[PDB]
Amino acid sequence: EVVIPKKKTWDKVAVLQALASTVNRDTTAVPY
Amino acid sequence: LPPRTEKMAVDQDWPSVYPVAAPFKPSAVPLPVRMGYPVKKGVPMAKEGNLELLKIPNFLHLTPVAIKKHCEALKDFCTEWPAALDSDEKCEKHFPIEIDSTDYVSSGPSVRNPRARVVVLRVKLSSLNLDDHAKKKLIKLVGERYCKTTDVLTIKTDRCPLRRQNYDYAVYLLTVLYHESWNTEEWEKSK
Amino acid sequence: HIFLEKHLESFPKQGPIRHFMELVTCGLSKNPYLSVKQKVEHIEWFRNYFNEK
Amino acid sequence: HAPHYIAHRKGWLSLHTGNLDGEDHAAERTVEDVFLRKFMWGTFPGCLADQLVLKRRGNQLEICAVVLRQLSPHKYYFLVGYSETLLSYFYKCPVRLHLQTVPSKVVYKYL
Amino acid sequence: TYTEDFIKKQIEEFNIGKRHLANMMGEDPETFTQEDIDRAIAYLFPSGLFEKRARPVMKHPEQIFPRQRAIQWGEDGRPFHYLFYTGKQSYYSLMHDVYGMLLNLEKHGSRWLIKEELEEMLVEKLSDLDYMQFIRLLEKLLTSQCGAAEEEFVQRFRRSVTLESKKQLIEPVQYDEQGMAFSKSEGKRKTAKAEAIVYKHGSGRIKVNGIDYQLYFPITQDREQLMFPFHFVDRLGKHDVTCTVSGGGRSAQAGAIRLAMAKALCSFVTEDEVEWMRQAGLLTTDPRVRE
Amino acid sequence: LHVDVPKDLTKPVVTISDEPDILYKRLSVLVKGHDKAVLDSYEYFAVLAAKELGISIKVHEPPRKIERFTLRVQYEMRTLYRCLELEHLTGSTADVYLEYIQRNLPEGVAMEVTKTQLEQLPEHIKEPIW
RNA sequence: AUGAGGUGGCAAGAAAUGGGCUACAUUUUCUACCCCAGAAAAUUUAGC
Ligand SMILES: [Mg+2]
């Protein structure tokens, strides 16, 4: 039987926010 | 001032130094990489002031550690293929119609592309409820869109500006073709 | 976009003008670069011109 | 290096998808590059050590320039802000600048 | 010029950069090798430049800087080698050794080393006459009853380049479902490409694209070209051929089929007949093509 | 960061909708570039990401194209291709993967994504009109 | 008046040589086929 999953959705910047949450601050650099 | 690669440890978190796509920074990349055709009794040029290394689309922001760390955080966004569809044998059984559409990624100010409106519907006639006369009429109506070898009817729509409109038009064309294949005019009798 | 033949109601129904405007609308219904408004504006210009002549 | 080394030893200063087979707007990108180069050579007079590198990803526009350490850093920041804002409002795209200072011209050979 | 402290510093910089690259690529720094360095640098800094040298490179400093500056005396100034003052201590040391071996023996598909390679190994420039003298001594050593040690010593100076044999690699024999033996081969002439299957036993039937050869090739010249391989080895009417040719024109297709059939037939003839076919031009791809 | 670390991170809001998800039988990603090394690096990145997301990927190399022209002085334009065919991925997986790899598309490289969605027959065509 | 107009004319002739374009066939031409058919009728340019 074909159980089609549900279409989960996210905000436009959601992927960028996840990728950003993946990385920490650079301790040896001056601010961006 | 001294480059900050002197302060970078041998066990640092490299992805935090290059989070996103960035140009080559010889003061940030702690590698003694050289590039350039050497002169006679010369060496390839050093990185500081090297325009050739600056011209490379470097992948310092995508290292295997960084890629794995990215793809572990992105798993939250994914859904699962219905396991009942194990192969194309069942993908062509439970879902007879196939809709092909294309997106184009160039570089510039305008994202528009005239070729993205095209839609291609593919359906096997054996998967439609057609009798002998209905199938004969449908084949004669469509013409070259029907390929005898594959038993596939391929309707390509690009008339409308948008892509949803071309998809709706392809569906409408299929509907009307089926209905006019199942219909026998008075005139048909003279074959 | 694809059925623009309702805008030919005020034209002649069976003369050569019907033929010409059927050709025009068949061309316009195959136009992916125009909006519906521009197509109907073309049809209305044709109406005006043929009304004058 | 001479022009017959452009894919053998040198590279391309500008990098964009326009000239690939099937892509469009190569002319517009070329004119954009021309204006960027003249504008930048007129806005950083005697600072640029070498040619610009013009990179393009999506609608982004990165100018990687190599300048000298002869002009004051405050003026460098003022000009970076000015040029970024002006070029973003002129091309209606997010332009960005990545100055790299060098103590002096990086001479390769003597011709 | 490159001082020794300068290269020392480049050595620590290379080692630290190697450890950093191992960190970046996730590999274990202890076992991270130079091939790994090359692969990682190729990934991180992709470059399509045709010149391999122009591409980005991260080598050991010793591989970059030549530094062919060997010290030949210590702090007291005494030279290390007893032939130092000749100026050719390595070359004359080698000549002394060879003469010693010649004296000892007197009491009891490969090539001589080229001059510049001998220079590379001796790390000293030498003239043509002294090279000839050394080679003459080596020949004299070979003429005498050289033992295992002397044979190895001369082999240090003997390179294996000379001679190359043109033997015409044969295709293997395959067997079809019916149990018949056949061999397949390919040929090309201009833009025509052909693949022929030659059976061991037959009655001389050639089928081109499923069509008889005399129907597929109306022109007698093409039929003579197809006849040439089998006639040359006197086995007309003894093999069946099933070929497929595409592209080109009439003569190009005939020539490609001729080549494919000859190469497939080489399986069922003796090596002498293979060499005769080669010397007749029947096994060489014709490279002549339009500008 | 050795001690100063973010105590918590705000994960983006991904909501599980009620609508059914789109299904893609195939998803062909053709990338074009002037540089073979850049395409090899992008292929490595894309394939590793596909493995880490569980997507099934195959890679092949379409033949190159060369456009030569003259103003004598002869100029050339090379176009090299890499094709990444993904199989049996849903709508959300395809969107997230495509966003990732398109945002990380290198300069000078263009993309053409062909998506082959699977659809059922419309209700209005199942049986003839009586 | 090197500006703007009007009224008439103007529309050449002969060679020797330099060059260019067209058609120029029987090993040809038309039809069927793509090759076993039937009807019609002196310097100069390259060489490899
Ligand atoms: Mg006149």
PDB file of all heavy atoms in Angstrom, chain F residues 18-30:
ATOM      1  N   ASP F  18      -0.529  18.855   6.553  1.00  0.00           N
ATOM      2  CA  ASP F  18      -1.542  17.831   6.348  1.00  0.00           C
ATOM      3  C   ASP F  18      -1.661  17.400   4.894  1.00  0.00           C
ATOM      4  O   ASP F  18      -2.170  16.306   4.627  1.00  0.00           O
ATOM      5  CB  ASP F  18      -2.903  18.338   6.837  1.00  0.00           C
ATOM      6  CG  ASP F  18      -2.961  18.488   8.344  1.00  0.00           C
ATOM      7  OD1 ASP F  18      -2.253  17.739   9.048  1.00  0.00           O
ATOM      8  OD2 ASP F  18      -3.709  19.363   8.827  1.00  0.00           O
ATOM      9  N   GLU F  19      -1.199  18.222   3.955  1.00  0.00           N
ATOM     10  CA  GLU F  19      -1.295  17.877   2.548  1.00  0.00           C
ATOM     11  C   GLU F  19      -0.341  16.730   2.215  1.00  0.00           C
ATOM     12  O   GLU F  19       0.659  16.526   2.907  1.00  0.00           O
ATOM     13  CB  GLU F  19      -0.965  19.088   1.681  1.00  0.00           C
ATOM     14  CG  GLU F  19      -1.949  20.235   1.817  1.00  0.00           C
ATOM     15  CD  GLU F  19      -1.655  21.371   0.857  1.00  0.00           C
ATOM     16  OE1 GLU F  19      -1.510  21.105  -0.353  1.00  0.00           O
ATOM     17  OE2 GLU F  19      -1.566  22.530   1.313  1.00  0.00           O
ATOM     18  N   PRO F  20      -0.627  15.964   1.167  1.00  0.00           N
ATOM     19  CA  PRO F  20       0.288  14.894   0.766  1.00  0.00           C
ATOM     20  C   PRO F  20       1.513  15.430   0.044  1.00  0.00           C
ATOM     21  O   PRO F  20       1.474  16.467  -0.621  1.00  0.00           O
ATOM     22  CB  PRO F  20      -0.571  14.036  -0.167  1.00  0.00           C
ATOM     23  CG  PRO F  20      -1.486  15.015  -0.791  1.00  0.00           C
ATOM     24  CD  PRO F  20      -1.816  16.005   0.296  1.00  0.00           C
ATOM     25  N   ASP F  21       2.609  14.693   0.173  1.00  0.00           N
ATOM     26  CA  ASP F  21       3.876  15.118  -0.394  1.00  0.00           C
ATOM     27  C   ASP F  21       3.974  14.724  -1.864  1.00  0.00           C
ATOM     28  O   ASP F  21       3.412  13.720  -2.308  1.00  0.00           O
ATOM     29  CB  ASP F  21       5.038  14.512   0.393  1.00  0.00           C
ATOM     30  CG  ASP F  21       6.323  15.294   0.233  1.00  0.00           C
ATOM     31  OD1 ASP F  21       6.424  16.090  -0.720  1.00  0.00           O
ATOM     32  OD2 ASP F  21       7.231  15.121   1.069  1.00  0.00           O
ATOM     33  N   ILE F  22       4.701  15.543  -2.624  1.00  0.00           N
ATOM     34  CA  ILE F  22       4.976  15.229  -4.018  1.00  0.00           C
ATOM     35  C   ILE F  22       6.033  14.136  -4.089  1.00  0.00           C
ATOM     36  O   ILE F  22       6.914  14.035  -3.228  1.00  0.00           O
ATOM     37  CB  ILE F  22       5.424  16.493  -4.773  1.00  0.00           C
ATOM     38  CG1 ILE F  22       4.288  17.522  -4.800  1.00  0.00           C
ATOM     39  CG2 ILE F  22       5.884  16.150  -6.180  1.00  0.00           C
ATOM     40  CD1 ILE F  22       4.353  18.539  -3.690  1.00  0.00           C
ATOM     41  N   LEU F  23       5.943  13.306  -5.122  1.00  0.00           N
ATOM     42  CA  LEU F  23       6.854  12.189  -5.320  1.00  0.00           C
ATOM     43  C   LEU F  23       7.571  12.360  -6.647  1.00  0.00           C
ATOM     44  O   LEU F  23       6.931  12.605  -7.674  1.00  0.00           O
ATOM     45  CB  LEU F  23       6.105  10.856  -5.292  1.00  0.00           C
ATOM     46  CG  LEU F  23       5.429  10.476  -3.974  1.00  0.00           C
ATOM     47  CD1 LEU F  23       4.628   9.203  -4.152  1.00  0.00           C
ATOM     48  CD2 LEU F  23       6.429  10.317  -2.846  1.00  0.00           C
ATOM     49  N   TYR F  24       8.891  12.233  -6.621  1.00  0.00           N
ATOM     50  CA  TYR F  24       9.730  12.335  -7.809  1.00  0.00           C
ATOM     51  C   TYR F  24      10.322  10.963  -8.085  1.00  0.00           C
ATOM     52  O   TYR F  24      11.013  10.401  -7.232  1.00  0.00           O
ATOM     53  CB  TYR F  24      10.834  13.369  -7.609  1.00  0.00           C
ATOM     54  CG  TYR F  24      10.335  14.783  -7.473  1.00  0.00           C
ATOM     55  CD1 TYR F  24      10.522  15.493  -6.302  1.00  0.00           C
ATOM     56  CD2 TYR F  24       9.670  15.404  -8.512  1.00  0.00           C
ATOM     57  CE1 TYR F  24      10.069  16.781  -6.175  1.00  0.00           C
ATOM     58  CE2 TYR F  24       9.210  16.693  -8.392  1.00  0.00           C
ATOM     59  CZ  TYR F  24       9.413  17.377  -7.222  1.00  0.00           C
ATOM     60  OH  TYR F  24       8.956  18.665  -7.097  1.00  0.00           O
ATOM     61  N   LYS F  25      10.042  10.416  -9.267  1.00  0.00           N
ATOM     62  CA  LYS F  25      10.699   9.174  -9.654  1.00  0.00           C
ATOM     63  C   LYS F  25      12.181   9.406  -9.897  1.00  0.00           C
ATOM     64  O   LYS F  25      13.032   8.725  -9.314  1.00  0.00           O
ATOM     65  CB  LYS F  25      10.043   8.598 -10.905  1.00  0.00           C
ATOM     66  CG  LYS F  25      10.110   7.095 -10.992  1.00  0.00           C
ATOM     67  CD  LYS F  25       9.534   6.596 -12.302  1.00  0.00           C
ATOM     68  CE  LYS F  25      10.516   6.751 -13.452  1.00  0.00           C
ATOM     69  NZ  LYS F  25      10.355   5.671 -14.462  1.00  0.00           N
ATOM     70  N   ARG F  26      12.504  10.401 -10.718  1.00  0.00           N
ATOM     71  CA  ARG F  26      13.872  10.764 -11.040  1.00  0.00           C
ATOM     72  C   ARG F  26      14.054  12.249 -10.800  1.00  0.00           C
ATOM     73  O   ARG F  26      13.092  13.014 -10.728  1.00  0.00           O
ATOM     74  CB  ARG F  26      14.233  10.456 -12.495  1.00  0.00           C
ATOM     75  CG  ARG F  26      14.306   8.996 -12.841  1.00  0.00           C
ATOM     76  CD  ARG F  26      14.865   8.825 -14.237  1.00  0.00           C
ATOM     77  NE  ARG F  26      13.982   9.412 -15.239  1.00  0.00           N
ATOM     78  CZ  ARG F  26      12.975   8.780 -15.828  1.00  0.00           C
ATOM     79  NH1 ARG F  26      12.678   7.524 -15.538  1.00  0.00           N
ATOM     80  NH2 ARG F  26      12.245   9.427 -16.731  1.00  0.00           N
ATOM     81  N   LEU F  27      15.313  12.648 -10.681  1.00  0.00           N
ATOM     82  CA  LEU F  27      15.660  14.062 -10.609  1.00  0.00           C
ATOM     83  C   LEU F  27      17.060  14.187 -11.198  1.00  0.00           C
ATOM     84  O   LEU F  27      18.040  13.828 -10.546  1.00  0.00           O
ATOM     85  CB  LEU F  27      15.588  14.569  -9.176  1.00  0.00           C
ATOM     86  CG  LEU F  27      15.601  16.081  -8.985  1.00  0.00           C
ATOM     87  CD1 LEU F  27      14.789  16.451  -7.766  1.00  0.00           C
ATOM     88  CD2 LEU F  27      17.010  16.604  -8.855  1.00  0.00           C
ATOM     89  N   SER F  28      17.143  14.652 -12.438  1.00  0.00           N
ATOM     90  CA  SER F  28      18.416  14.774 -13.128  1.00  0.00           C
ATOM     91  C   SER F  28      18.945  16.191 -12.974  1.00  0.00           C
ATOM     92  O   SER F  28      18.244  17.159 -13.280  1.00  0.00           O
ATOM     93  CB  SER F  28      18.266  14.427 -14.607  1.00  0.00           C
ATOM     94  OG  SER F  28      19.435  14.778 -15.326  1.00  0.00           O
ATOM     95  N   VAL F  29      20.179  16.305 -12.495  1.00  0.00           N
ATOM     96  CA  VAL F  29      20.838  17.585 -12.298  1.00  0.00           C
ATOM     97  C   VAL F  29      22.020  17.659 -13.247  1.00  0.00           C
ATOM     98  O   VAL F  29      23.039  16.996 -13.033  1.00  0.00           O
ATOM     99  CB  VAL F  29      21.291  17.748 -10.837  1.00  0.00           C
ATOM    100  CG1 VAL F  29      21.852  19.123 -10.613  1.00  0.00           C
ATOM    101  CG2 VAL F  29      20.144  17.458  -9.880  1.00  0.00           C
ATOM    102  N   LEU F  30      21.888  18.439 -14.311  1.00  0.00           N
ATOM    103  CA  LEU F  30      22.966  18.628 -15.273  1.00  0.00           C
ATOM    104  C   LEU F  30      23.670  19.937 -14.943  1.00  0.00           C
ATOM    105  O   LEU F  30      23.054  21.006 -14.987  1.00  0.00           O
ATOM    106  CB  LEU F  30      22.419  18.637 -16.696  1.00  0.00           C
ATOM    107  CG  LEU F  30      23.435  18.820 -17.821  1.00  0.00           C
ATOM    108  CD1 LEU F  30      24.307  17.594 -17.952  1.00  0.00           C
ATOM    109  CD2 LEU F  30      22.730  19.109 -19.125  1.00  0.00           C
TER     110      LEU F  30
END
